[PDB]
């Protein structure tokens, strides 16, 4: 089960809106999780099953599935959200991830 993530990296200023795309070569249903890792910090879940918020995460992240395409909307970005986002499916993990930093 191959999993790819786009874009490799992206940047946005404070308070903007961003999206991250995850493409799965197979139809894995809604079982998609996304994980955010701040630099020098173990990652913590924020969205599970691709449309239900994790415990203790702000509501500015909203997931969405369109077929094999998966993405979530990040609104009103604030500068504690700079880090690396990874989309994981089943056993596989997205190589690289997406680095988000302010410009």
């Amino acid at each position: 089960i191959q999993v790819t993530q786009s874009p490799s990296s992206l940047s946005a200023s404070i308070g903007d809106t961003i999206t991250v795309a995850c493409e799965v070569s197979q139809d894995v249903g809604w079982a998609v999780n996304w994980y955010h890792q701040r630099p020098g910090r173990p990652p913590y879940n924020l969205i599970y099953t691709a449309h239900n918020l994790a415990p203790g995460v702000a509501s500015r992240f909203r997931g969405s599935r369109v077929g094999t395409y998966f993405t979530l909307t990040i609104n009103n970005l604030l500068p504690e959200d700079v880090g690396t986002y990874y989309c994981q499916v089943f056993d596989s993990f997205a190589p690289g991830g997406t680095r988000v930093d302010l410009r």
Partner: protein, 132 residues
């Protein structure tokens, strides 16, 4: 749940490394029907991250009966176990190469049917360095 982890480690190539992840007061659940404590069916996943690149999945241990399952390309050199009495999980990685140096995370999975492969709580991460 709190996931304490062992301290940083340095080993030599070709040796073995042992990493311990502790999850106190989380191996047992309540079965209100019988009204007795049981060992939960949670999965202790193990993840690794090389410096610079994204995370990778080594294996997981279902602690109900010590069932395990490793990744394909690590098989034959990684052994995963847990101790229910100590409520801990042990990763034993053998024959480390130069490229195996990295930070290892232990992850907790409630093994809920609705949410497959979900990790809630993560350990502080143990950095293991291999060199001569």
């Amino acid at each position: 749940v709190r996931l304490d982890q062992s301290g940083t480690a340095v080993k030599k190539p070709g040796a073995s490394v042992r990493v311990s992840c502790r999850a106190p007061d989380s191996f047992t659940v309540y079965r209100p029907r019988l009204s007795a404590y049981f060992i939960g069916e949670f999965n202790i996943h193990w993840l690794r991250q090389a410096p610079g690149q994204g995370l990778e999945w080594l294996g997981f241990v279902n602690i109900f009966r010590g069932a395990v399952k490793y990744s394909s390309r690590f098989q034959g050199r990684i052994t995963i176990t847990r101790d229910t009495s100590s409520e801990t999980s042990y990763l034993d990685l053998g024959a480390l190469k130069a490229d195996d140096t990295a930070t290892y995370y232990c992850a907790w999975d409630k093994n809920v049917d609705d949410n497959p492969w979900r990790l809630d709580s993560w350990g502080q991460g143990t950095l293991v360095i291999v060199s001569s």
